[PDB]
Write a protein that binds this ligand. Sequence first.
Ligand SMILES: *[C@@H]1O[C@H](CO)[C@@H](O)[C@H](O)[C@H]1NC(C)=O
Ligand SMILES: *[C@@H]1O[C@H](CO)[C@@H](O)[C@H](O)[C@H]1NC(C)=O
Lengths: 47, 47, 500, 499
Amino acid sequence: VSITKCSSDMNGYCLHGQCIYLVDMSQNYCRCEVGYTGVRCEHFFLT
Amino acid sequence: VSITKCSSDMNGYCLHGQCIYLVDMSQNYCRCEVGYTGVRCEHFFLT
Amino acid sequence: EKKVCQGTSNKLTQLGTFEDHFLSLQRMFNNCEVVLGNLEITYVQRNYDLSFLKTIQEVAGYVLIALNTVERIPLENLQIIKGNMYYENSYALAVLSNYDANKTGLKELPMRNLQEILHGAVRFSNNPALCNVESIQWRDIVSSDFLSNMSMDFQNHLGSCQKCDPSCPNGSCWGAGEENCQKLTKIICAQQCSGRCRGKSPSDCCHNQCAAGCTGPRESDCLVCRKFRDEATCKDTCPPLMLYNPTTYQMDVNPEGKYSFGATCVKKCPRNYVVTDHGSCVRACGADSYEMEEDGVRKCKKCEGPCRKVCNGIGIGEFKDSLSINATNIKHFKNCTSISGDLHILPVAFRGDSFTHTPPLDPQELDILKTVKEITGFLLIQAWPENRTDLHAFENLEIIRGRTKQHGQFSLAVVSLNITSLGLRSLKEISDGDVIISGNKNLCYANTINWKKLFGTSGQKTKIISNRGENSCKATGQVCHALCSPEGCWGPEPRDCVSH
Amino acid sequence: EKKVCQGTSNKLTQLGTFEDHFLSLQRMFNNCEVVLGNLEITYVQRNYDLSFLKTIQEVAGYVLIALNTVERIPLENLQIIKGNMYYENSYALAVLSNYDANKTGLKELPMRNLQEILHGAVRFSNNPALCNVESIQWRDIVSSDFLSNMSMDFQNHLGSCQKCDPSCPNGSCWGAGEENCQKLTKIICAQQCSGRCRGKSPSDCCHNQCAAGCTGPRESDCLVCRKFRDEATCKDTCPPLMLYNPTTYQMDVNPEGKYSFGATCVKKCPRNYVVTDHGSCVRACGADSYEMEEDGVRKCKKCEGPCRKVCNGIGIGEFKDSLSINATNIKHFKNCTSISGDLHILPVAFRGDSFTHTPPLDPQELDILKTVKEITGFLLIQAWPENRTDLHAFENLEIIRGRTKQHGQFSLAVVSLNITSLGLRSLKEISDGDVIISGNKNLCYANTINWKKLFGTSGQKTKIISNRGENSCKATGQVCHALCSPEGCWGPEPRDCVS
Ligand SMILES: *[C@@H]1O[C@H](CO)[C@@H](O)[C@H](O)[C@H]1NC(C)=O
Ligand SMILES: *[C@@H]1O[C@H](CO)[C@@H](O)[C@H](O)[C@H]1NC(C)=O
């Protein structure tokens, strides 16, 4: 209702995470694994 | 009389002028000759 | 003097189970009162305490508050958004989509002490449970030049919120209690007044260099400084080191003159930074200029002749939004000896990124970086060619200065590699910043080096964990050569030894 | 913008007859609106028109109105006395002993527009006919500090001076009429005013860089700028050429950037002055620097390492109030190649002065001036060893920049010498300022040179007068050598030909 899941084309948007779709902005972002930060799960973060 | 002649201990004060004593201020200044300026009549100016 | 935190630019991106996200927010903005980047309150679930948010008083970038089912967000003493970077290139603040499945999300945002946003606008949308935000008059806070890009979905479907106390003028309040009354300081001053006064009283009118307001007329009484601050005063420009004498037509030294660093006027530039002749601390000298050391001072000097390539770092200039070095930008580092910035080596380069239209990177081209001896910022290596045993391309790298540091802390990071050794034989100085060596499953010789002799600041720490165990490496014979064990070794060979 | 004049520092010394004194003062302050130095009105007698003083609007040094018997001194439009220099080390404005034997003298000093004296105190004494000025409340005009030692002895014996118009505030005026009422811009101000005010109402304050007053409430509304004037906007410092960026720890370019020239902010430095990388127009680069021409402008550039010795000229530094180079100060010119300033050689140096406690100059010590190749100001030679025939020590002088001028006009003065030839062999440029060569009774080889080729600024003049006649010089054989080009010669010998 507030998030959905991303298309098949967006397989590699999240380097270290899973893609999310935000419906109110009509945008797409990432849910990063533990220990990785950045909009695309870019860099490893201290702990 | 408010302007007088300076004492003899002031012969060489005016380089190109005559020494005058201002009593109202108790100070020794100069009356410069023509073509000369400055407090002690140091400099030469074109008239 | 004020406590300092960097900030986050993850935007609407989440880190882990919402727990871990909350832990990261708490860890970053705990005991922080000046935010040097962006303040991002995202994915904050209900029954979670946001008490530390009370400490924040100043934010340089944008403030985003989104996707929060937590009821209260206590940004009560925040006083300024400098808007030095925007959200969606237009919004200095944005409170968006803080709602729940049963319409039970954000409810309270008592920003009673926000008075100015120098650059940017704000945008409000999908705020179903937020109370009393409708009452706020944003013409005071935002500069006029931005009132156009100012978006405003102030609508409350719930409509079950306590109205504004009589002490709140025009019925404008950020919450309930009369302390949440929207104090105004912009237009309600006087015709002669230009600075943001205390009130309509022309006597109670503030300096231009005041930002939010003032407790008194002089510039020492400014609540927040607009541009620079010198000790306790606010200034448009930091006091020059030498001033013009109109009478003598010559330059004369200024006693109150101090150097320019960031938004501060400091008597001494930091050591790793460079000093320009104008009297300011710079991170990099412009083109046709170089860095030397003269009489105790690292200074920029104009060069005519040899000089060098500009060699800007990743994230800067040419590499504006570049995540890593790769085929599209690898050619620009041909004969770079010093790197004016940072280097990021990430796995996406070797895999390739279709979204940024980046083709895969040939490992052999990394050798181009053998000519680099100096990096002014930080070096981050998260990926390396599997076939190689060491960081061969940085065998001639000698110094990392740590002017810019990863997450504000690390100047050298080597993570997630199959390398057996490091091979940084020419490395001698890490001027500032900490060194993390982690996740390197086959690395052994890193623990022999006394990194403290490569550090230029007391307090620089080394975090070497999650690599191949020292006992295992000793058992396999992966230890320093015996002819060279005074100080350590970057690998098995005598050449990889340091003191020898 | 405003017409300038140099000023006079003769103090109470009289220059010739009363008429000659008046003529010099008229020459100096005619059409002048800004006195860059001191305004000295002395020994001006009755029936002499002082109307040309109405144009003066600003004085930077001091104002000394003394020993005048003239009835009126029309300083009607004088607004500010900056007080950069003080009379007797404590007074910016001093009106002293303006009377005659019949106790006739100065009656009217209609300074109806004098609202501030930045630095300095005021002194009035022994002016027995000065009318109406006693009523002035100098506390509005003077700075708060210097008010400490202000000497006010008002005593108009006559009392037959008209009374101030009733409209004048607190009965204070400068003279007869509503015209000459006093204007108050300090004491009448509002509570906790920034600087000054145009009115009594709290909204009538001025900007803190307004000096005399304001037409409104803004920095562009100031009557006079306190520190700097960036083309009709009063400012503390001229806009820096570059601005620091707090977000990006690097320097950026200021479009509003502006060079400094005196109290003015200018988009380009004047012709002869040299620009620093600071964005400042100076008259001389320091010993740490040297002048050169980059991109068509002379600028200061930091030294490579082996720069040439630069020495302060006469009048600056250890030579503060020294009249001439002399046995006490000659030592400090040993190895100098450039002179930041002036060089005066007067007969008092060779003759010795008792009052400056200075012995006579050994002539051959002059020889340590052969190392001098550049002078940023003027060369005033009024004396020279009578038994030497040219200016030997200045044989290797190469350029006279003339950034500072004698009397504001001359950069090379050679007066009253027995030298037979000039002997300025290495001189190649007189950048600015006129040249005077006068009173040298034995001098030849002066009109031969095309002085215009030496000059570097249009409008430079040559005045060669009262020397040995050209016809006489040619009659007994004092013409340039045969080897000399038609361009001229500095002397008789072959090494004296030009270019
Ligand atoms: C003063 O200037 C005016 C014109 O500006 C001129 O007519 C007058 O002769 C000048 N007087 C002197 C003494 O130069
Ligand atoms: C008058 O006061 C000023 C204040 O700066 C001081 O310099 C000066 O010496 C004083 N006058 C005398 C005669 O001391």
